[PDB]
Ligand binder design. Structure first.
Ligand code: GDS
Ligand code: GDS
Ligand code: NIN
Ligand code: NIN
Lengths: 220, 220
């Protein structure tokens, strides 16, 4: 047929590529997904997914999931459906993306490593508890903010909010499920409100459905 | 006298605020440093340093060290001495900042936690080795790139390069010093070249000197 605009190098299990999948569906953009078995370093020297190739921009490549989000909205969100136009809003949107990238992803991922996805002999629930506690602390930070604002930035849905979704879903369903009586809605009602709003959006729900189906299809 | 432009909430031991200290000195900007004992959540809901108050911009506040770097150069680097002007360069500069924020800081910090700065009973050199190995992997990523480019972006010094300095110095002097025969110049000569270029810059050297002096003055 005709070449789609984007290649998203993604992974069925790993959360981070699905931030980008969510945004591409939200904006209605055309992309193929390549699930990478975890070249590729030719597209990202760090050797990690996601990476994005923009075939309609001379095969421009961007890696780091949150940098990909910014690229997409800076080039392909002219009506600012999921982004912002003023300088002040832009820098605060970037602030919250860096909090996601440095404060959620890595620490949620260490909980996942020691609880769930390391080789079984290397899993360690005692060490994992350090990062389960960090998950709850991050939830507490989000709670203190979202108790008094609808969205993170400019009172509108942006990629700042979207960037938190996939790891938050992983945390609630897996990483802190059953941890010391954790109850998402009771313990962090504002985060629950915000998260539930996000995952019930058609495009985001479609992304989560696609991820589940993709896991079901990957053998094993 | 007269109020300085910026307040940098910093810490003597913690690396991350010193990225911002480096940039402010490089640009010759006026700032006071407040060393926070580790309000403050009034300036950052995450409750972490650094945070920046811009008194000449109606006390605008930005937190997350790499978001602070972007704020400073986007508003106060009109000649692009440590930043870039084209879209393509801007997005790749942001890409490398997100790699620093998500791939260096957090994993280097976990090595520091389990090796060096956790309460002594909670330190664990076996667990630390997971993150010492991640330090070397990050060095290997930087090596593969810096063997064929002088600086990370646009063949010029930017905040992308500066953002890596403080954690790299901590890693070489502490976190992987003596780890399995680690020798910075022999094992990662390109990273060593780049890092040495950075720390010998007067403003960056001044920042590192100030940090050492600040540790020497903080009692204990
Ligand atoms: N900051 C990067 C992180 C990208 C990333 O982590 N990609 C994973 C797939 S998501 S899977 C989640 C991922 N876990 C892992 O990657 C587990 C393997 C790893 N080497 C380890 O030892 O921890 C993690 O914890 N991420 C922390 C974060 O989100 O910031 C990958 O490619 N792994 C290949 C490999 O490791 O060899 C981004 O957002 O793009
Ligand atoms: N991404 C943020 C990280 C900022 C940050 O980590 N600030 C530290 C001082 S630098 S000191 C380095 C810091 N270690 C710590 O903060 C140790 C305490 C922590 N609660 C823990 O249990 O790990 C770390 O590992 N950082 C990972 C990274 O750079 O991304 C802080 O305020 N700590 C107060 C507290 O923890 O209560 C940024 O760059 O601004
Ligand atoms: O990558 N992880 O660290 C991780 C951990 C726990 C769960 C899942 N998950 O459900 O896809 C992923
Ligand atoms: O904060 N840390 O994780 C850390 C670790 C190891 C060393 C230093 N240091 O030297 O300032 C800091």
């Amino acid at each position: 047929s005709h070449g789609k605009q984007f290649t998203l190098f993604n992974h069925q299990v790993g959360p981070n590529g699905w931030k980008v999948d969510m945004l591409l569906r939200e904006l209605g953009l055309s992309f193929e997904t390549v699930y990478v078995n975890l070249s590729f370093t030719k597209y990202n020297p760090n050797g990690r997914i996601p990476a994005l190739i923009d075939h309609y921009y001379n095969d421009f490549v961007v890696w780091e999931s949150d940098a990909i989000l910014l690229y997409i909205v800076e080039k392909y969100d002219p009506e600012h459906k999921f982004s912002v136009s003023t300088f002040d809003d832009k820098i605060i949107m970037t602030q919250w993306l860096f909090f996601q990238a440095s404060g959620q992803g890595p620490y949620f991922g260490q909980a996942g490593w020691f609880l769930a996805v390391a080789p079984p002999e290397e899993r360690n629930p005692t060490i994992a508890e350090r990062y389960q506690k960090e998950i709850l602390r991050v939830f507490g930070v989000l709670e203190s903010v979202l108790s008094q604002r609808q969205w993170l930035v400019a009172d509108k849905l942006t990629i700042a909010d979207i960037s938190f979704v996939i790891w938050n879903a992983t945390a609630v369903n897996l990483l802190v499920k059953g941890y010391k009586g954790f109850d998402f809605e009771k313990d962090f009602p504002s985060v629950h409100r915000w998260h539930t709003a996000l995952i019930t959006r058609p495009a985001i729900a479609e992304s989560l459905k696609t991820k589940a189906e993709a896991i079901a299809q990957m053998n094993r």
